[PDB]
Amino acid sequence: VPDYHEDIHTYLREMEVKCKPKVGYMKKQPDITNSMRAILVDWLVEVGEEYKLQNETLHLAVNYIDRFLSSMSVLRGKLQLVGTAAMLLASKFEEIYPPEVAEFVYITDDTYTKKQVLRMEHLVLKVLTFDLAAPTVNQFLTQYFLHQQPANCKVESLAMFLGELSLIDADPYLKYLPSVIAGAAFHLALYTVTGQSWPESLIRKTGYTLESLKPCLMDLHQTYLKAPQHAQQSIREKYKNSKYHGVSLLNPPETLNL
Amino acid sequence: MENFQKVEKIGEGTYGVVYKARNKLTGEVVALKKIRLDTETEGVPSTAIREISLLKELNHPNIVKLLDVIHTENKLYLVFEFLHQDLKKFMDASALTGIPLPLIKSYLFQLLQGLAFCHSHRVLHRDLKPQNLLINTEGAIKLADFGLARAFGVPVRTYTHEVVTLWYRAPEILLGCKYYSTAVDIWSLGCIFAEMVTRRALFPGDSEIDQLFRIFRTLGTPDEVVWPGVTSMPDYKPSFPKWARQDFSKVVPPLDEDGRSLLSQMLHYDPNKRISAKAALAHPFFQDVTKPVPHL
Numbered sequence: 001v002p003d004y005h006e007d008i009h010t011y012l013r014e015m016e017v018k019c020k021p022k023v024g025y026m027k028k029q030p031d032i033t034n035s036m037r038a039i040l041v042d043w044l045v046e047v048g049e050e051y052k053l054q055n056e057t058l059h060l061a062v063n064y065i066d067r068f069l070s071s072m073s074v075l076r077g078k079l080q081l082v083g084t085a086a087m088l089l090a091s092k093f094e095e096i097y098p099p100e101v102a103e104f105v106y107i108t109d110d111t112y113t114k115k116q117v118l119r120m121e122h123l124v125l126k127v128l129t130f131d132l133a134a135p136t137v138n139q140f141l142t143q144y145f146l147h148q149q150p151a152n153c154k155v156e157s158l159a160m161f162l163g164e165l166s167l168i169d170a171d172p173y174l175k176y177l178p179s180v181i182a183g184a185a186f187h188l189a190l191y192t193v194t195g196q197s198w199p200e201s202l203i204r205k206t207g208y209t210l211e212s213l214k215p216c217l218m219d220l221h222q223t224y225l226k227a228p229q230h231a232q233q234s235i236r237e238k239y240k241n242s243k244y245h246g247v248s249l250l251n252p253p254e255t256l257n258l
Numbered sequence: 259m260e261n262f263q264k265v266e267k268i269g270e271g272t273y274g275v276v277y278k279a280r281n282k283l284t285g286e287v288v289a290l291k292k293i294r295l296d297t298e299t300e301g302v303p304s305t306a307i308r309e310i311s312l313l314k315e316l317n318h319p320n321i322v323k324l325l326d327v328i329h330t331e332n333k334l335y336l337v338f339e340f341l342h343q344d345l346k347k348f349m350d351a352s353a354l355t356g357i358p359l360p361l362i363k364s365y366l367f368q369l370l371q372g373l374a375f376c377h378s379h380r381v382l383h384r385d386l387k388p389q390n391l392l393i394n395t396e397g398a399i400k401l402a403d404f405g406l407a408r409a410f411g412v413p414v415r416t417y418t419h420e421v422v423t424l425w426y427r428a429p430e431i432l433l434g435c436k437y438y439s440t441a442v443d444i445w446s447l448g449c450i451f452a453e454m455v456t457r458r459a460l461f462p463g464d465s466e467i468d469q470l471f472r473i474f475r476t477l478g479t480p481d482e483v484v485w486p487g488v489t490s491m492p493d494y495k496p497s498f499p500k501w502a503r504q505d506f507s508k509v510v511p512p513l514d515e516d517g518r519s520l521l522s523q524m525l526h527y528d529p530n531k532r533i534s535a536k537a538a539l540a541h542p543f544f545q546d547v548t549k550p551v552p553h554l
C-alpha cells in the first residue's frame with residue numbers, strides 16, 4: 001500500500017531516461033547485427049531457464065549489453081563474452097546466490113576462460129560506470145499490476161511474455177522507454193485475455209493515454225502475431241510452462257480496435 | 259592510490275578492511291574501503307556491486323557519502339566521507355551513564371529521514387544495526403554499509419538461509435515470508451531506538467526460534483486478530499506458547515508517552531500496519547527535536 005508507490009514510480013521514470021541505450025547504435029557497430037543480438041538474447045533466456053534465474057536478471061543483462069554496445073565496438077567473436085559478463089553481473093546484482101563464475105564459463109562451451117569472463121566483468125562495470133540499478137519492463141509491469149481489477153494470473157503472465165519478446169528485437173524496441181513497452185504489454189495482455197483496456201487509474205498515473213501507446217502497441221501486436229514464426233523461440237518454449245499458465249499457447253487477437 | 263596516505267585501520271565491513279586515509283593534495287580525511295580482488299576466483303563481490311550502484315544514486319545528509327571509486331586491475335577501493343565512529347561503540351562508551359534522551363531523539367529523527375530517502379528511491383537497506391550507523395562530532399548520524407541492500411523495483415525474495423543479523427530481524431522474516439518489504443527496516447530501527455533507550459539489545463536471541471520467542475515474550479504471541487495471516491505462515495506452529503503483551507512502560511521505562519506510542523508503532527507485528535518512515539517523521543514524539551552533540 002506503500003507511501004512510496006508514487007515516489008518510486010516517479011523516480012523509476014527519471015532513471016529510465018538516464019539508463020537508456022543509444023537507439024542508433026547497431027548501425028555504428030561495424031561487425032555485429034540486430035540479428036546476432038537476437039541470437040545472443042535468446043541464448044540468455046535459455047541460460048536463465050537452465051539456471052532458474054529470475055526474469056529480472058534477464059532484463060538487467062539485456063540493458064547492460066545495449067548500454068555497453070552503445071559505447072564500445074565489439075567483434076562478433078567477442079559478443080558472447082560481453083553477454084556472459086553482463087549475465088554474471090546482473091546475477092550478482094539481482095540473485096540471492098548467483099551461479100559461480102565457472103558455471104558461466106561452462107555455458108559458453110569453454111569458448112572463453114575464467115580470466116576472460118572476469119576481465120570482461122571489470123570492463124563492463126567501467127563502461128557502465130557501476131550504474132547497474134536500471135529500470136526494466138519487468139519493473140514497470142510489476143507496478144502496473146497493482147491497478148488490475150481484479151487481478152488475473154493469465155493477464156500478468158502474458159504481459160510478462162510480451163515484455164520479454166521485446167528484448168529480442170532491437171529492431172524496433174530500442175525506440176521505446178521500458179514504461180511504454182510495459183504500457184503496451186499490459187494493455188495487449190488485458191485485451192487478449194479479457195477484452196478490457198488500459199485502465200484510467202494507469203492513464204492518470206503514467207500520463208500515458210491509450211493513444212500515446214499506439215505506436216508501441218502496433219509494434220507489439222505484430223510481434224505477438226509473428227512470434228510462432230520468429231527465428232528465435234526460447235521465450236515461447238519457456239512460456240508454455242504451466243508455471244506461466246501456458247499463455248504463449250493462447251491465440252493473439254487478430255485486431256486491436258484502435 | 260597515489261594521492262592517499264593510509265593513516266590507520268578502522269574496521270571491516272561486508273568485503274572489508276576500512277582505513278582512515280588522508281588526501282595528500284587537498285588535506286581531506288576519508289575512509290577507504292579496500293576490496294581484495296581475486297581475479298581467478300569470483301571477481302567483484304556482489305556486496306560491492308550493490309553498495310556502489312545504490313550509494314551512487316543516494317545523495318542525502320543522513321546517508322554516508324561515496325566520494326569516489328578507484329577501480330584498477332587488481333584492486334577496488336571505495337572512498338567514503340570519514341565519520342568519527344559507529345553507534346555501537348558510542349553506546350558501549352555511554353553505558354552506565356546512558357545516551358541522553360534528546361540525543362536519542364535526534365538520532366532517531368535523522369535515521370528516519372535517511373531511510374525515508376532510501377525507500378522513496380526503491381532501496382531496502384536490510385541490515386540496520388548499530389555498527390552500520392555512523393556518527394560525527396557535530397551531532398549527525400548516517401546509514402552506512404549498503405553491502406546487503408537491494409533495489410525493490412520488483413519485490414525482493416527472501417534468503418532461505420539468511421546471513422543478515424538475528425537481533426534486528428523482523429518477525430515476518432522469522433516466520434518465513436517470501437518477500438522483504440520496507441517494513442523490515444522500520445522494525446530494525448525500532449529495536450535500535452529501544453536499545454539506545456535501555457542500554458541493552460531489545461531482542462538478543464541465540465537462534466531463529468529463540469529470537470522469535472524473545473519477541474513473543476515482550477510483544478505477546480501474535481494471532482490472527484493482531485496479524486491476519488500469521489497462522490498460515492510457513493514457519494508458524496500452533497504449538498507456540500501463548501504469552502501476553504507486556505506494558506510498554508515495563509519495556510522502555512525512561513520513555514514518555516509519545517515515544518512509547520511511536521515505538522509500539524515501529525514494532526507492529528503486521529508489516530502492513532507497521533509505520534512507514536515517512537509517517538514516523540510526522541509523529542508528535544518529534545515536535546520538540548533538537549541537534550545536541552555527542553560527548554565523544
Ligand SMILES: Cc1nc(C)c(-c2ccnc(N)n2)s1
Binds near residue numbers: 339342
Ligand atoms: C562499510 C563501512 N564501514 C565503515 C567503518 C565505513 C566508514 C565510513 C566513513 N567513516 C568511517 N569511520 N567508516 S563505510
